[PDB]
Amino acid sequence: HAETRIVTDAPRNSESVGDHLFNGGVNHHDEDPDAYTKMYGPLVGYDPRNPTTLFANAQTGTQLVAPRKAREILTGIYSFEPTVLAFQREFVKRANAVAQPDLNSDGFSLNGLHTTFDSIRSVSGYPQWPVSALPKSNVGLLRDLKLQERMTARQVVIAREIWKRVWGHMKPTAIKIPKMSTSGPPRNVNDAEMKLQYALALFSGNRYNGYLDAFKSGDLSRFYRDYEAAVIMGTNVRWQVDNPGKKRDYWAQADIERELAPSKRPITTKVEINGTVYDDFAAMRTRLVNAGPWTINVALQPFATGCMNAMFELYRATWHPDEDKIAGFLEGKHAFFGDVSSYDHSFSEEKIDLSLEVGKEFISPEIMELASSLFYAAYFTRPLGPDDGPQLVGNPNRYLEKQVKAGNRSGHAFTSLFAKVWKVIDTVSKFDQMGYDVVANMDAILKGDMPFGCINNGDDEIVWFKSERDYRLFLRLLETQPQEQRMFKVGPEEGAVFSGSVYQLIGPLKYQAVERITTPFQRIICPERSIGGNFRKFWPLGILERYNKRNSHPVLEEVWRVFDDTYATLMEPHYGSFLGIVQRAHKEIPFSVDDLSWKEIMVLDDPNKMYHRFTDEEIRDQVQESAFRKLQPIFFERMFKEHYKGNYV
């Protein structure tokens, strides 16, 4: 067949997906063009006069995006209970007494500890409100961050060279289809079987071409009707423990319609649990995250993952070094651990557009414009504070025009790729400001065969130098960088942390990796999510892994001593033994703490690390399958043959 539509004229819900499960071998949708149409139901229908109904069958209307609701931190222990709060008080005070952060002027910890334990007096499930909204424009943020208005000529050349190498190489890799997250509109279900069947549809017959024709027409009704697609972001919230004494502000929902780049209001949330003020406790910090619909992202992800997998291979020293060897690598080398403020939101419009423009050299233009549509899409959010209502920001009916300019948009197939590449572009520009010819020597820099380079994990980076004069001029360059050179607001990172571990300065140019000592106790005592449920099915593993290496560092060992003793006195009599709780749940999960590598345990705690930190080769199938369905490259080879002109790696 040669059908161009995913949704044909066939009668809907006339077949059952249970009768056409995918066997890894043949794409049934090749044999039957009406199959996707028949196995799923009629859509509600898109009325351009009220686009929010895209999200109607999903959490609805008025429920807050971040409700105040106590977490189950451990089996039978809930975060709003006084006993817990009293425990947190005593633990933090005891842990502070046993260890204080010993930092030098460069920002390195000499003892391993980089901060106090005060943040563990945070009440999980009790959010700072309002959750800060996304303004229609970010130019006020660029101006507040005193960043460049545009890139310099040389920076545009450097960016073109690096993106040429990234878009120009692809290592075809399975599309990862997430099991536990929403498809977003129009179906708004957490159904990886549907997401997979949709993918088989898009990549069978002439559906991808048909999808793009509909996309580029600008006829939202047609694109929705025939491909169950609409260019619009839904909204989520991520929770984390806040840092004492940082400026806590937010963009109000009421302000974002009044001007494009409104100023920020102060968060004033206090912790009061049924009329009892906890003046020494913090509410959880909340951050708005967008999430793109599967039916938009599925068309972009092959390129995203293909380009990134090739990038990890061709330029491993920059983008995918053996994490366990980093400390040994930096030995005898000077190191700058960068810290970036509002990285992703601070991406200029020019930078997003340049990325997609260079991509058109290697990928069909309609695919890059689709990507451009999602980066700049309208979004719908449920209330962000208790006084707000639901809100559509932007006009999705005009999706071919830019609606929201929010930099490297969260929820986009390209988000991690963009994070990774632009941080290197920034840093390599600095190498060029130092008087080296980065264009001539670009591959050697990226492969790590020059006297200096950078080790990247998105906004987190290590810039390394064999020479002390290079290192010093680099620091000088940052202290004296004029605004027109300033791509991102970068400063040195207190504690010198990279990918979760403090790089302890144990001797002259000798570093030692230790996981941030606060992390274990934050993740237990102040979790983003309750144990179990959707995202925390494997929760005993992360705890037991950490507990089993408690003796591996002197400060870690003493803090764990204070956790155990304090838990034993203040918690155990009410809730039972800590290890009792952790081991009983341990025995319920399919993997032992000893069955798994540290990398596999991280993926089980955050599956999205499969999209940016680990490859298929490092994580066993049984672990990946816990969170993902997959569609192997052969099933979208045809699409690539037509739409990709780069090199296969």
Binding-site residue ranges for Mg(2+): 19, 259, 338, 459-460, 493, 497, 616, 619
Select the span of 202-210, 215-223, 321-329, 494-502 touching Mg ion (CB under 5 A). 494-502
Q: Which is nearer to Mg ion, 133 or 497 (CB)?
A: 497
Nearest approach, Cβ of residue 629 and Mg ion (Å):
33
Report residue 259 CA to chain centroid gap: 28
Nearest approach, Cβ of residue 498 and Mg ion (Å):
5
Q: Which is nearer to Mg ion, 96 or 512 (CB)?
A: 512
Nearest approach, Cβ of residue 456 and Mg ion (Å):
10
Q: Which residues are CB-contacts of 143 (< 8 A; sequence separation ≥ 6)?
A: none
Give residues 77-136 in contact with Mg ion (rule: CB under 5 A). none
Nearest approach, Cβ of residue 458 and Mg ion (Å):
10
Contact in structure between 461 and 317 (CB atoms under 8 Å): no
- What is the rounded distance in angstroms from the CA atom of residue 302 to the CA atom of residue 318? 22
Q: Binding site residues, as ranges?
A: 19, 259, 338, 459-460, 493, 497, 616, 619
- What is the rounded distance in angstroms from the CA atom of residue 168 to the CA atom of residue 162? 10
Size of the residue set binding Mg ion (CB under 5 A) = 4
Nearest approach, Cβ of residue 521 and Mg ion (Å):
20
Contact in structure between 147 and 194 (CB atoms under 8 Å): no
For 117, 376, 378, the CA distances from 137, given in Å and listed in that order, are 36, 10, 12
Q: Which element (helix H / strand E) includes 506?
A: strand 501-507
Give residues 458-487 in contact with Mg ion (rule: CB under 5 A). 460
Give the other-Cβ count within 10 Å of 447's Cβ: 14
Contact in structure between 417 and 371 (CB atoms under 8 Å): no
Q: Which is nearer to Mg ion, 271 or 517 (CB)?
A: 517
Q: Which is nearer to Mg ion, 215 or 343 (CB)?
A: 343
Q: Which is nearer to Mg ion, 41 or 491 (CB)?
A: 491
Q: Residue 610 is encoded by which pair of tokens?
A: 């499969």
Q: Which is nearer to Mg ion, 389 or 491 (CB)?
A: 491
Nearest approach, Cβ of residue 437 and Mg ion (Å):
28
Q: Which is nearer to Mg ion, 278 or 337 (CB)?
A: 337
Q: Which is nearer to Mg ion, 170 or 463 (CB)?
A: 463
Nearest approach, Cβ of residue 285 and Mg ion (Å):
18
Select the span of 4-12, 35-43, 74-82, 490-498 touching Mg ion (CB under 5 A). 490-498
Per-residue interface string for the shown chain with Mg ion, residues 184-223, x marking contact by CB under 5 A: ----------------------------------------
- What is the rounded distance in angstroms from the CA atom of residue 406 to the CA atom of residue 234? 14
Length of the chain: 649
Contact in structure between 247 and 268 (CB atoms under 8 Å): no
Q: Which is nearer to Mg ion, 58 or 463 (CB)?
A: 463
Nearest approach, Cβ of residue 113 and Mg ion (Å):
16
Give the other-Cβ count within 10 Å of 517's Cβ: 25
Per-residue interface string for the shown chain with Mg ion, residues 616-645, x marking contact by CB under 5 A: ------------------------------
Q: Which is nearer to Mg ion, 465 or 498 (CB)?
A: 498
Best CA proximity match to 293, nearest among 356, 363, 219, 211: 211
Q: Which residue is nearest to Mg ion (CB)?
A: 460
- What is the rounded distance in angstroms from the CA atom of residue 430 to the CA atom of residue 424? 10
Q: Does 515 bind Mg ion (CB under 5 A)?
A: no
* Residue 115 main-chain phi, psi, to 5 deg: -155, 170
Q: Which of 282, 374, 497, 619 binds Mg ion (CB under 5 A)?
A: 497
- What is the rounded distance in angstroms from the CA atom of residue 244 to the CA atom of residue 445? 38
Nearest approach, Cβ of residue 474 and Mg ion (Å):
16
Give residues 423-462 in contact with Mg ion (rule: CB under 5 A). 460
- Looking only at the bridges linking them, the beta strands covering 501-507 and 510-515 are antiparallel
Q: Which of 493, 515, 545, 600 binds Mg ion (CB under 5 A)?
A: 493
CA dihedral 76, 82, 88, 89 (to 10 degrees): -170
- Which SS3 state, helix, strand or coil, does residue 638 take? helix
Best CA proximity match to 307, nearest among 454, 411, 420: 420
Give residues 132-171 in contact with Mg ion (rule: CB under 5 A). none
In 275-346, alpha helices (H): 294-297, 301-314, 316-319, 326-330
Select the span of 95-103, 251-259, 320-328, 498-506 touching Mg ion (CB under 5 A). 498-506
Select the span of 106-114, 203-211, 321-329, 493-501 touching Mg ion (CB under 5 A). 493-501
- What is the rounded distance in angstroms from the CA atom of residue 261 to the CA atom of residue 255? 9
Using CB under 5 A, list all residues that contact Mg ion.
460, 493, 497-498
